[model samples]
Target: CSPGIWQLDCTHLEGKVILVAVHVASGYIEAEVIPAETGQETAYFLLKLAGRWPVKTVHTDNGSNFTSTTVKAACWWAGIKQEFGIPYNPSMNKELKKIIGQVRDQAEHLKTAVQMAVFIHNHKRKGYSAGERIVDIIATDIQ
Candidate 1:
């Protein structure tokens, strides 16, 4: 998850939040808003949300925040195996790259509109996975 204020310069920066999550098995992505940029809090929240699903594994890039002790502890407590992608390895999570590419290509020349695009992507956009629709799986729990 990448959450913090956007910084246009090295001096002035405002606080904003960006939360990102990817489902490795299904290529499902989820995003939300966060209050701050603390790894401990992010790990805690991720653990809580992940509790709802039968998550047995997690894959993340070699970002310091994701590799922090807090995140590791959370994963251990949750009994989820964690794997980090090798640095500079683009194929580690090609699904993420595909999602980013779709978002970028669709939102070109509308950078500021990416957030709304992401919102639609998560809630409205439907994709097929393993001969099933992603939205259908999500809807199963509701009914």
Candidate 2:
């Protein structure tokens, strides 16, 4: 409840998909660029980062990929808890997602937009830990 638990979420900007694992308590986030909004895609990135950022519960909206078997297997294998959001709602992204989408359209390439990621990562999510430079609060609790 204080820190260390990670929240898993994803967003897109102009079709370029970005997946992120944010620390629910401290706001630390581990993100990566993926192919699209599918189970394999998000699962790939999530698996890659799971080793680095210790996660307890990963809360996510019920996206197809987010609920996919592969993703479940990965989480279970890693001994993590998986939580779902409003069954099937994208309500959380109304604003930031729009900006992310627009920002992608406003960029040259997916790779070139890494600069904006820091900005994106640091952008204040009013209720999520005051939105500081949340990189690795769940840094050392490996599990």
Candidate 3:
């Protein structure tokens, strides 16, 4: 895992909180149903994801969760660069919206829907499995 650019964003579904991260180069995605959209939640999610995959730079909106000291410290200690998008910018979150829509349409339950959505999004594309590509990168990094 040479440094890859990742995007993070938060959204809601039927009153449940959702957080998402996507690999910009590979289109690989990971999502979770969090208890709330707070700084602690954001920090925990980022740490957990970084544990599984190497992160270089994280792109997120100017939300309080992304700006909070907790999240900032997490990124700092992890050595991940954090970038916030301009206020009211949609392009920065475009990929997150695409994944969110899929989860929205197919989800009956919040957690499972997102889990399934991530699996499908990363694996369904024939001849282009982002999940596989991501794993390859991590495996190579370990070598």
* TM-scores, all models, native as reference: 0.52, 0.63, 0.76
Considering every candidate listed, which one attains the maximal lDDT?
A: 3
lDDT string for model 2 (27-117, tens) is: 4445566676777776666667667655556766544545688888887787777554324443334444543555666677764454465
lDDT of 1 at 54: 53
In candidate 3, stretches whose alpha carbon ends up further than 4 angstroms from where it belongs are: 1-3, 84-108, 137-143
**Local distance difference test scores for all models:** 0.48, 0.59, 0.74
**How many angstroms is residue 82 displaced in model 1 relative to the true structure, after the best TM-score fit?**
1.3
Ten residues in sequence with the least summed lDDT for candidate 1: 3-12
Model 2 segments more than 4 A misplaced: 84-107, 119-143
lDDT of 1 by residue, 30-143 (tens): 544455666776677667756765555555543555667887788788786644332336631244334444665555333333355445445553444422443455456456
Candidate 2's displacement at residue 22, Å, is 1.7
Check candidate 3 and list the clashing pairs: none
- Residue-wise lDDT of candidate 3 within 1-143, one digit each (tens)? 23367878887766888787878667788888899889999998889888877887887664555778999899998888865432454642355456556776675676876777677778866575988877776677678
Global fold similarity of model 1 (TM-score):
0.52
TM-score comparison, 1 vs 3, better candidate: 3
